[PDB]
Write a protein that holds these residues in place. Sequence first.
Motif, PDB file in Angstrom:
ATOM      1  N   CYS A 174       8.787 -33.808-107.117  1.00  0.00           N
ATOM      2  CA  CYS A 174       8.316 -32.463-107.037  1.00  0.00           C
ATOM      3  C   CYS A 174       8.589 -31.857-105.709  1.00  0.00           C
ATOM      4  CB  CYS A 174       6.806 -32.410-107.298  1.00  0.00           C
ATOM      5  SG  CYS A 174       6.406 -32.912-108.922  1.00  0.00           S
ATOM      6  N   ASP A 175       8.407 -32.610-104.632  1.00  0.00           N
ATOM      7  CA  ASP A 175       8.694 -32.061-103.290  1.00  0.00           C
ATOM      8  C   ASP A 175      10.180 -31.726-103.112  1.00  0.00           C
ATOM      9  OD1 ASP A 175       6.058 -32.404-102.617  1.00  0.00           O
ATOM     10  OD2 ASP A 175       6.421 -34.127-101.285  1.00  0.00           O
ATOM     11  N   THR A 176      11.047 -32.522-103.697  1.00  0.00           N
ATOM     12  CA  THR A 176      12.461 -32.199-103.532  1.00  0.00           C
ATOM     13  C   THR A 176      12.884 -31.019-104.414  1.00  0.00           C
ATOM     14  OG1 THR A 176      12.967 -33.847-105.111  1.00  0.00           O
ATOM     15  CG2 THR A 176      12.985 -34.458-102.921  1.00  0.00           C
ATOM     16  N   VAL A 177      12.263 -30.831-105.576  1.00  0.00           N
ATOM     17  CA  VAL A 177      12.517 -29.591-106.344  1.00  0.00           C
ATOM     18  C   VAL A 177      11.996 -28.390-105.588  1.00  0.00           C
ATOM     19  CG1 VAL A 177      12.058 -28.190-108.407  1.00  0.00           C
ATOM     20  CG2 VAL A 177      12.664 -30.634-108.702  1.00  0.00           C
ATOM     21  N   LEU A 178      10.782 -28.525-105.055  1.00  0.00           N
ATOM     22  CA  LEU A 178      10.159 -27.439-104.319  1.00  0.00           C
ATOM     23  C   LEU A 178      11.026 -27.133-103.072  1.00  0.00           C
ATOM     24  CD1 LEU A 178       6.475 -28.362-104.896  1.00  0.00           C
ATOM     25  CD2 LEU A 178       7.723 -26.405-105.809  1.00  0.00           C
ATOM     26  N   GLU A 180      23.941 -35.441-118.425  1.00  0.00           N
ATOM     27  CA  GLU A 180      23.105 -34.996-119.505  1.00  0.00           C
ATOM     28  C   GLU A 180      23.514 -35.657-120.886  1.00  0.00           C
ATOM     29  OE1 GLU A 180      22.999 -30.840-120.488  1.00  0.00           O
ATOM     30  OE2 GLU A 180      21.009 -31.054-121.409  1.00  0.00           O
ATOM     31  N   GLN A 181      24.803 -35.679-121.213  1.00  0.00           N
ATOM     32  CA  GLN A 181      25.277 -36.326-122.448  1.00  0.00           C
ATOM     33  C   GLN A 181      24.952 -37.808-122.494  1.00  0.00           C
ATOM     34  OE1 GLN A 181      29.261 -34.265-121.934  1.00  0.00           O
ATOM     35  NE2 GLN A 181      29.102 -34.767-124.105  1.00  0.00           N
ATOM     36  N   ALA A 182      24.949 -38.435-121.325  1.00  0.00           N
ATOM     37  CA  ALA A 182      24.745 -39.849-121.220  1.00  0.00           C
ATOM     38  C   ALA A 182      23.240 -40.140-121.086  1.00  0.00           C
ATOM     39  CB  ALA A 182      25.511 -40.354-120.012  1.00  0.00           C
ATOM     40  N   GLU A 183      22.412 -39.100-121.177  1.00  0.00           N
ATOM     41  CA  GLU A 183      20.973 -39.207-120.868  1.00  0.00           C
ATOM     42  C   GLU A 183      20.702 -39.918-119.576  1.00  0.00           C
ATOM     43  OE1 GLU A 183      19.197 -40.365-124.620  1.00  0.00           O
ATOM     44  OE2 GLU A 183      20.699 -39.084-125.511  1.00  0.00           O
ATOM     45  N   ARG A 184      21.499 -39.597-118.576  1.00  0.00           N
ATOM     46  CA  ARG A 184      21.338 -40.178-117.257  1.00  0.00           C
ATOM     47  C   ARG A 184      20.717 -39.112-116.356  1.00  0.00           C
ATOM     48  NH1 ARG A 184      22.618 -45.437-115.234  1.00  0.00           N
ATOM     49  NH2 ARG A 184      23.766 -44.319-113.589  1.00  0.00           N
ATOM     50  N   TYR A 185      19.413 -38.894-116.507  1.00  0.00           N
ATOM     51  CA  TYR A 185      18.843 -37.687-115.888  1.00  0.00           C
ATOM     52  C   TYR A 185      18.637 -37.791-114.397  1.00  0.00           C
ATOM     53  CZ  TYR A 185      18.351 -36.102-120.581  1.00  0.00           C
ATOM     54  OH  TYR A 185      18.624 -35.721-121.817  1.00  0.00           O
ATOM     55  N   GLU A 186      18.461 -39.000-113.886  1.00  0.00           N
ATOM     56  CA  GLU A 186      18.396 -39.147-112.439  1.00  0.00           C
ATOM     57  C   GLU A 186      19.715 -38.806-111.808  1.00  0.00           C
ATOM     58  OE1 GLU A 186      17.054 -42.356-110.346  1.00  0.00           O
ATOM     59  OE2 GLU A 186      15.221 -42.732-111.593  1.00  0.00           O
ATOM     60  N   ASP A 187      20.790 -39.263-112.418  1.00  0.00           N
ATOM     61  CA  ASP A 187      22.123 -38.863-111.954  1.00  0.00           C
ATOM     62  C   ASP A 187      22.291 -37.341-112.113  1.00  0.00           C
ATOM     63  OD1 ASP A 187      22.824 -41.493-111.585  1.00  0.00           O
ATOM     64  OD2 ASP A 187      24.126 -41.553-113.409  1.00  0.00           O
ATOM     65  N   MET A 188      21.853 -36.802-113.240  1.00  0.00           N
ATOM     66  CA  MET A 188      22.029 -35.413-113.501  1.00  0.00           C
ATOM     67  C   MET A 188      21.347 -34.647-112.357  1.00  0.00           C
ATOM     68  SD  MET A 188      20.918 -33.265-116.749  1.00  0.00           S
ATOM     69  CE  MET A 188      21.506 -31.599-117.126  1.00  0.00           C
ATOM     70  N   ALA A 189      20.142 -35.067-112.024  1.00  0.00           N
ATOM     71  CA  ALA A 189      19.381 -34.395-110.985  1.00  0.00           C
ATOM     72  C   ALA A 189      20.045 -34.548-109.638  1.00  0.00           C
ATOM     73  CB  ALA A 189      17.960 -34.932-110.968  1.00  0.00           C
ATOM     74  N   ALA A 190      20.533 -35.724-109.301  1.00  0.00           N
ATOM     75  CA  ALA A 190      21.202 -35.934-108.020  1.00  0.00           C
ATOM     76  C   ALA A 190      22.412 -35.023-107.964  1.00  0.00           C
ATOM     77  CB  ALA A 190      21.643 -37.417-107.777  1.00  0.00           C
ATOM     78  N   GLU A 222       2.976 -42.366-108.653  1.00  0.00           N
ATOM     79  CA  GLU A 222       2.501 -41.063-108.304  1.00  0.00           C
ATOM     80  C   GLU A 222       3.284 -40.559-107.101  1.00  0.00           C
ATOM     81  OE1 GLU A 222      -1.767 -40.477-108.304  1.00  0.00           O
ATOM     82  OE2 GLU A 222      -1.569 -39.831-106.268  1.00  0.00           O
ATOM     83  N   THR A 223       3.535 -41.474-106.175  1.00  0.00           N
ATOM     84  CA  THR A 223       4.238 -41.132-104.929  1.00  0.00           C
ATOM     85  C   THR A 223       5.687 -40.698-105.231  1.00  0.00           C
ATOM     86  OG1 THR A 223       2.839 -42.510-103.544  1.00  0.00           O
ATOM     87  CG2 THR A 223       4.944 -41.988-102.689  1.00  0.00           C
ATOM     88  N   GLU A 224       6.312 -41.410-106.164  1.00  0.00           N
ATOM     89  CA  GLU A 224       7.658 -41.099-106.533  1.00  0.00           C
ATOM     90  C   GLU A 224       7.758 -39.730-107.224  1.00  0.00           C
ATOM     91  OE1 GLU A 224       9.189 -45.613-106.976  1.00  0.00           O
ATOM     92  OE2 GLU A 224       9.579 -44.150-108.615  1.00  0.00           O
ATOM     93  N   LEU A 225       6.827 -39.459-108.115  1.00  0.00           N
ATOM     94  CA  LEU A 225       6.730 -38.178-108.791  1.00  0.00           C
ATOM     95  C   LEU A 225       6.582 -37.082-107.739  1.00  0.00           C
ATOM     96  CD1 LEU A 225       4.202 -37.619-111.781  1.00  0.00           C
ATOM     97  CD2 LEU A 225       4.364 -35.956-109.909  1.00  0.00           C
ATOM     98  N   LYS A 254      13.340 -31.852-115.119  1.00  0.00           N
ATOM     99  CA  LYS A 254      12.282 -31.874-116.143  1.00  0.00           C
ATOM    100  C   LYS A 254      12.247 -33.280-116.742  1.00  0.00           C
ATOM    101  CE  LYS A 254      11.834 -31.098-121.109  1.00  0.00           C
ATOM    102  NZ  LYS A 254      12.222 -30.508-122.449  1.00  0.00           N
ATOM    103  N   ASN A 255      13.419 -33.834-117.046  1.00  0.00           N
ATOM    104  CA  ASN A 255      13.502 -35.161-117.585  1.00  0.00           C
ATOM    105  C   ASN A 255      13.074 -36.266-116.603  1.00  0.00           C
ATOM    106  OD1 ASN A 255      14.549 -35.323-120.476  1.00  0.00           O
ATOM    107  ND2 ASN A 255      15.633 -33.557-119.610  1.00  0.00           N
ATOM    108  N   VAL A 256      13.526 -36.193-115.351  1.00  0.00           N
ATOM    109  CA  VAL A 256      13.124 -37.142-114.335  1.00  0.00           C
ATOM    110  C   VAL A 256      11.614 -37.080-114.213  1.00  0.00           C
ATOM    111  CG1 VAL A 256      13.206 -37.695-111.877  1.00  0.00           C
ATOM    112  CG2 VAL A 256      15.345 -37.066-113.121  1.00  0.00           C
ATOM    113  N   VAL A 257      11.095 -35.903-113.958  1.00  0.00           N
ATOM    114  CA  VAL A 257       9.682 -35.819-113.656  1.00  0.00           C
ATOM    115  C   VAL A 257       8.875 -36.079-114.926  1.00  0.00           C
ATOM    116  CG1 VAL A 257       9.054 -33.373-113.968  1.00  0.00           C
ATOM    117  CG2 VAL A 257       8.312 -34.563-111.940  1.00  0.00           C
TER     118      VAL A 257
END
Lengths: 221, 221, 6, 6
Positions: B89-93, B17-27, B82-85, B52-55
């Motif tokens: 969403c599917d992985t959050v769900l 989050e501090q590094a604004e690395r949101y994909e990492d944050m999410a992983a 769109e597919t990636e989004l 929220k940031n990734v999506v």
Amino acid sequence: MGSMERASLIQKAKLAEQAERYEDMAAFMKGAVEKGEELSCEERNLLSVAYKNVVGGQRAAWRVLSSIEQGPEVREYREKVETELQGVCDTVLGLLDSHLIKEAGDAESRVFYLKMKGDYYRYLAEVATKKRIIDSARSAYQEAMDISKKEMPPTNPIRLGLALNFSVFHYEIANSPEEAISLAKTTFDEAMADLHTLSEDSYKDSTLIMQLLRDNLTLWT
Amino acid sequence: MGSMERASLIQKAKLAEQAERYEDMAAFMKGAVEKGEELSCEERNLLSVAYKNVVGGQRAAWRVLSSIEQGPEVREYREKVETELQGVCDTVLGLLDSHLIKEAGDAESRVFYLKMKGDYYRYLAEVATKKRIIDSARSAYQEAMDISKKEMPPTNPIRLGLALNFSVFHYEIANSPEEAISLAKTTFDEAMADLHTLSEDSYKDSTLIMQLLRDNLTLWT
Amino acid sequence: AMSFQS
Amino acid sequence: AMSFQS
């Protein structure tokens, strides 16, 4: 990107740029370069923009992390980011070396790629803990400086951006702030003296870059 | 993230989050959730922030592309984004359904996750071309609204953010701008009337969210 | 329209 | 220090 048309990769790189999707932009541009044809001016810019943004986010992340660094997690995660950055720099360097630089005959393409080679070695140098990397940066910049000085007007945007980055290299990486300052000043002064030859649009392009030299000099002096 | 300590994933999510690395944050947060333990308030926020940031970047890219869309490349690349989004969403769900929601007993966690479920179905709905998805969003929001109204004060930040998003859903997705407006107004008015019960810090937290309801209402009326 | 700025 | 904003 092997199955996508070159023109399609270029078109999608421009869309990714509009969408601020720079990793995609870079993947598309890497696909394009790997078609094995030379890049036009515009394509070289796309390539540069894409990777500048990718590596720019990695550099910014790495510095946040490095600073926090000053259990093993902070170091691990800085290493992770650092490793990814280095892999990006290695793949840009890979593209330059296979085979963009060797097929770049015009001063325009050759200085552009050599500058880029110096840049990505400079990014590698920023996180290296290293003399060989710094020397690879210096050497690539130096070769680019020699061609640009022989083959381009002092106001050419790439000549200016090359000299700006080489000056940053000197200041930030080579521990040679005097060299940095002398370069930025000499570059700005010679560009200043060539502005009279330009159209209004080229004048705007050059002076926009000269202002970065001037801003650096103000920071450094 | 199977081999990393839960606490290490959380620590690294905060660094990302501090590094604004949101994909990492999410992983990292996905790794944490997949440790199978419930998330604290703070961890739920990390999870939310990361995705929220990734999506958010995917949504912004998708809309740029969609608009350009109005040869096959534009559509292809919008589909790619769109597919990636949708995969995000599917992985959050997926995480909500396995097994965050079912183990969320407190009103705090349960409303948070149900809101989130509605959100990620709403993101799915934004690109769907769809009634089932909209209904899954509505249903998740509705269940969250019912618990929040029974179990939380009208100024609770999550109750407020839930009602704000449900109002956005109504306006933007359900084609029910009146429902959107009635909800935002009723939510704001009941929060207004509960502010007197709050400390200065809770007051600041709630009124910050109430202002988004108010800004939406100003946009919508 | 603004959604919750989580 | 600013580098070339390519």
